[PDB]
């Protein structure tokens, strides 16, 4: 049965509820963003209206052939309204397209849902600062203390100096990028415009990004592997057996492989030879210090978490991080 945390109370809508059939009473199924374990279920034979962001329209449309006539995409920052109610979405700081919604009921109560956030200051200066929140359908993937990662830019600054001085030093080394989801795209882009590269990447994949609305994307994709000293290959060939096949594949050429699995939460590589094997702590969701701060600048004054509700010790423990900021910031 589709859980309390994905319905919005006073209304008709789900969020992210797609693996549940048919939910009774749902009106409108919103979809916060095009990773696998929010979009499960959804099809092309998904008969009922949904609501995305443009990005996430076109997954939909080009990736699951969701018929686009129950496709509704929404902009961004904009006051829309769905079957009667005011809704706005927010950039998510996620992956591409991955929104926040704002539900304004009309009794008054506003309800914001971060989907799956990577939470910034930067938020705090935008439409969420004007009125006040009272539920809060939060992300918690992190919520606990010994989730501290770097930002982004510190992350990205490490793997850009570490290709570079490494195809610098031989010129006929490969870099290798793991990628499964959409999102941590900055990571292959920023890596092949330091070495004046395009990306190579299977069909489905330059298919993906091309449904991302990045600007100048073809200027920095290809689906011609060997002209590319950058190459995107899944995740779970990201390991020395994988590498070793991928390395021969390349006509022979490419003496060395030098590989990033952007994993978050867990830096020197795992070598096996002529391939090393750098996971980088590149993360889209909030660390727990940014799901603090933006809790406590918010002051909701109910809380569910999304993420981690499946057993009461994760339950209780989160419950008693929410009192502790609470007591804290005096809301
Ligand atoms: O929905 C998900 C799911 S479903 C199964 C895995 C995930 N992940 C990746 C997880 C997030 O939490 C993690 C904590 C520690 C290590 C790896 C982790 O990877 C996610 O980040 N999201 O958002
Ligand atoms: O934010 C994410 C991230 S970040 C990395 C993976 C994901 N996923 C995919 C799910 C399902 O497939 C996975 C496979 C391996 C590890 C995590 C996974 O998590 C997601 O569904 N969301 O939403
Ligand atoms: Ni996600
Ligand atoms: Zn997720």
Known sequence: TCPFYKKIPGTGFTVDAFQYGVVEGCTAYFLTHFHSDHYAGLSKHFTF??????????????????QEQYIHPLPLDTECIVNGVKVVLLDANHCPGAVMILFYLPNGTV???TGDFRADPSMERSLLADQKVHMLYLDTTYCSPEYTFPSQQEVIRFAINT???????NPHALVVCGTYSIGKEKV???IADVLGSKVGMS??????????????????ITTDMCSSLVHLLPMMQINFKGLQSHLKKCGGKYNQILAFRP???????????????????????????????????????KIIPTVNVGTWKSRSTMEKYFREWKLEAGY
Do not use: D
Not at 207 to 220: A, G, M, R, V
């Open 188 to 190: 292959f882009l920023a």
């Open 203 to 220: 069909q489905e994949k330059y298919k993906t990004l091309q449904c991302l609305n990045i600007p100048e994307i073809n200027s920095l």
């Open 49 to 66: 209206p949904v609501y995305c962001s443009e990005i996430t329209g076109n997954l939909l449309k080009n990736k699951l052939h969701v």
């Open 111 to 113: 309800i914001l849902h």
């Open 163 to 169: 290709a570079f001085e490494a195809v610098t030093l």
């Open 263 to 301: 994993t978050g939460w867990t830096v020197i590589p795992q070598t096996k030879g002529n391939i090393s094997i750098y996971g980088i702590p590149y993360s889209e969701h909030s660390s727990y210090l940014e799901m603090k701060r933006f809790v406590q600048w918010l002051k909701p004054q």
